[PDB]
Structures are given as structure tokens and as C-alpha cells.
Design a protein around this ligand. Structure first.
Ligand SMILES: NC(=O)CC[C@H](N)C(=O)O
Length: 415
């Protein structure tokens, strides 16, 4: 099956990218290649990232509008509220687990005001311009007029504001009744065309992923040397993802529904493998909906609401990774975490996970939110970037798994 072919090709692409990076490093790596050759060698991964970032905007906006407009107000008050509560609770639990694992395992064993960071988050939630929000985000800087904060708009898609606006606009379209059906159809057709584009991009995804991994491994001085530093961090991220996906989320599924959660996961394994390979829940959306509807019997409306929304708003893996990274930093640099700082980390991780793009680059783009809110050195992300190619795949797997289990839980709640 071509879906299984895509999964196989993407996993083999990750493995072959690791092998190619190791081989290139054995031949001298960047030092031997020189910028001229290195840029061309790494270019295909950049091209894949550009292709996915191009489709983020229309994909997210149209999917969210359609999902929000897929339920009537009679169901929005019950299904919508419960879905929002489930997403919030799951993200909070993922962030708490990340904090706990990072503090316990201590990965690092051996500037913007917090108020300004939260105000910037609130401003990004409510964008002042929809067109500007498509490629810019609010950010506060300081001028010694005593520091006085002045707010600029800096490069970077405002996924959070676009998500909020899309959900609100879908709800408004549902409110309109027959008058809004034309726009619902328009946005559904646009989303379907964007999914066709995503399916086409996923066929280039193998080569792009291979070259991206190879470049990210050639960039570092030596795998055996960088992994010496980052082994505890990688272990914390992967262990937290495994605990959340195999124990916590299944435990919630079993508590709110007396069905077997792993039987549910068996019917979405293929979505999970595609998520691991591509590391883009947005690209995993179609197969995910197909599996939840057919293999697990989730009702059509339940899926069409929960999954397109969850894929952008709900990301337990992204939240857990960002939280474990925010705790890993502050240990590379000798800062300390108290209860207030931990709670700030949790809240900022929730907001950042909501504001992440469902693609390979989602995590680090918004980890800066947490780092600024905890006043941690932002430049340290350069280290995480050297390994993000590995953690991000588990992040995406958990992000899609949360969506699937939420769909099942809501389907049982509606029964
Ligand atoms: N590192 C992350 O979690 C970013 C988002 C993730 N790649 C996803 O598709 O869900």
C-alpha cells in the first residue's frame, strides 16, 4: 500500500540520513566540504521545510474554520467545551510530566520580563491584523527612556492568533446558518486542495528528511561527542513521550471509557508511524481521520471536529519537549526553578504548544516563548537544534496520538 510505502520510505530516509551524515563526517564533514558544498548539500532539507511552511497557513486556517463550523451550537456547548477541556488537561499533564522527568533526571547535571512575555503572548493570541499575523508576531523590546517597553512585530508566523481567529470565525459561520454555508463549503474545498498539496509534498518528504538529518549530523562536531552532552536530554524527552503515550493518555482513555486503549492505538498505528516519519501531524491528518473513522468507529462529525482542530491546538508531544528543554536550559546555565517559575513554564508550554506548527520546525520556533518567559539564554537553542530532528518525531507521534485518543474518548462521551 502506498501509505505503507510512504511510512517505509520516510523511516528509511531518516536512517539513511543518519548514515549519510556519519559518512560525510568521516570524510571530514563541514571542514572538508566548505560552505560552498555544505549549503548545497543541506539545501534539500531546507526546501522540504519551505514547502511545509508554505502550506501551514492555508492548511491551519481552513482546517480550523471547517472544524469549528462542523458542529452546531447545540453540540458546541457539549462537544466543543469537553474537547477544549480535554485538550487543556492533556497538555497540562504533558507539561507536568516533562517538568517532573527533567527535574528528576537532571539533564544538565554536569532578556525579557516575565510580565512582558505574558503580555506578548496575550497580544499574539488576539492579533491586531490578520494579514500581518500570517508572517509576523508581536514582541516586546526595551528602550532606556529606567527601561520602557516598546512593542514591535518581528518575523514569524503567528500560529496562535491565526488559530484563535479561525476557531472564532468558524463558530461565527455556524451561527449564521444558511447564510454561512457558502463560506463553510469554500473553506472545506480550500482545505481539501491543501491536503492534496500536502500529499504531493509527502512524496518529496523522504529525500528532504534524509538530507535534513544528514546536514544536522554533519553540522555537529561529532555524534559521539554531542550525544555525550545531550544523552540525558534525549532520554528525558523520549521517556516522557513513551510514558504519556503508553501510560498517561491510555490511562485517561481507560478511566473515562472502559474500552481497551491499546486496541484503539492498534487501529491508528499507521497514522502514528507516518507521524514519526514525516514529523508533521498536519500531513498525518488525512490518514488519521480515515483510521479513526473506519478502524475505530469514531463518528464522522466527531472526527471532523476533533482531529483538524486537535492537530493544531492539541500537541502533548510539543508541550512535553518544550518543557523538558526549558528545564534542560537553566541547568546548562546555573539558574534555579521555584514553584512560580515552574507554573510559568507549564503555562507558557501550553500556550507555545497551541502556537506550534504541525510540521518538523514547530517546536523550536515557539520554545523561545518559554525561554524568554523564564529569562533563559535563547542562544542555547542552537544545541537543541542539533538534536531536534530526533526529538521532534516522538513529539509528533505523541501529538497525533493525543488527537486520536481524544476523538475516541469524545465518541464514547457522546454514546
Ligand atoms: N516539535 C514539535 O512538537 C513541533 C510539532 C510537531 N512536528 C508536530 O507535527 O506535531
Amino acid at each position: 500500500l502506498r501509505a505503507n510505502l510512504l511510512v517505509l520510505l520516510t523511516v528509511v530516509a531518516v536512517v539513511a540520513g543518519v548514515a549519510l551524515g556519519l559518512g560525510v563526517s568521516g570524510a571530514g564533514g563541514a571542514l572538508a566540504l566548505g560552505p560552498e558544498r555544505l549549503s548545497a548539500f543541506v539545501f534539500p532539507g531546507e526546501l522540504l521545510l519551505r514547502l511545509l511552511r508554505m502550506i501551514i497557513l492555508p492548511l491551519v486556517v481552513c482546517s480550523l474554520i471547517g472544524g469549528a463550523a462542523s458542529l452546531d451550537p447545540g453540540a458546541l456547548g457539549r462537544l466543543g467545551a469537553w474537547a477544549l477541556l480535554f485538550f487543556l488537561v492533556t497538555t497540562l499533564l504533558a507539561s507536568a510530566l516533562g517538568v517532573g522527568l527533567a527535574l528528576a533526571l537532571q539533564p544538565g547535571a554536569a532578556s525579557k520580563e516575565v510580565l512582558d512575555s505574558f503580555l506578548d503572548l496575550a497580544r499574539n493570541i488576539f492579533p491586531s491584523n490578520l494579514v500581518s499575523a500570517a508572517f509576523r508576531s508581536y514582541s516586546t523590546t526595551y528602550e532606556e527612556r529606567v527601561k520602557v517597553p516598546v512593542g514591535q512585530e518581528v518575523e514569524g508566523m503567528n500560529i496562535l492568533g491565526l488559530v484563535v481567529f479561525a476557531i472564532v470565525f468558524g463558530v461565527a459561520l455556524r451561527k449564521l446558518g444558511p447564510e454561512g454555508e457558502l463560506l463553510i463549503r469554500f473553506f472545506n474545498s480550500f482545505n481539501e486542495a491543501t491536503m492534496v498539496l500536502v500529499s504531493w509534498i509527502m512524496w518529496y518528504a523522504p529525500v528532504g528528511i534524509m538530507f535534513l538529518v544528514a546536514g544536522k549530523i554533519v553540522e555537529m562536531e561529532d555524534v559521539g561527542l554531542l550525544f555525550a552532552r545531550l544523552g540525558k536530554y534525549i532520554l528525558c524527552c523520549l521517556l516522557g513521550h513513551a510514558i504519556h503515550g503508553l501510560l498517561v493518555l491510555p490511562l485517561i482513555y481507560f478511566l473515562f471509557t472502559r474500552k481497551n486503549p491499546y486496541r484503539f492505538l492498534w487501529g491508528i498505528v499507521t497514522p502514528l508511524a507516518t507521524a514519526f516519519g514525516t514529523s508533521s501531524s498536519s500531513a498525518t491528518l488525512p490518514l488519521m481521520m480515515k483510521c479513526v473513522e473506519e478502524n475505530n468507529g469514531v463518528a464522522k462529525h466527531i472526527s471532523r471536529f476533533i482531529l483538524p482542530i486537535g492537530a493544531t491546538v492539541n500537541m502533548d508531544g510539543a508541550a512535553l519537549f518544550q518543557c523538558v528543554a526549558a528545564v534542560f536550559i537553566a541547568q546548562l546555565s546555573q539558574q534555579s526553578l521555584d514553584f512560580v517559575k515552574i507554573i510559568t513554564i507549564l503555562v507558557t508550554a501550553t500556550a507555545s504548544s497551541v502556537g506550534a506548527a504541525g510540521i518538523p520546525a514547530g517546536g523550536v520556533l515557539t520554545l523561545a516563548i518559554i525561554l524568554e518567559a523564564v529569562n533563559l539564554p535563547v542562544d542555547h537553542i542552537s544545541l537543541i537544534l542539533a538534536v531536534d530532528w530526533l526529538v521532534d518525531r516522538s513529539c509528533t507521534v505523541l501529538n497525533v496520538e493525543g488527537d486520536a485518543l481524544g476523538a475516541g474518548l469524545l465518541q464514547n462521551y457522546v454514546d
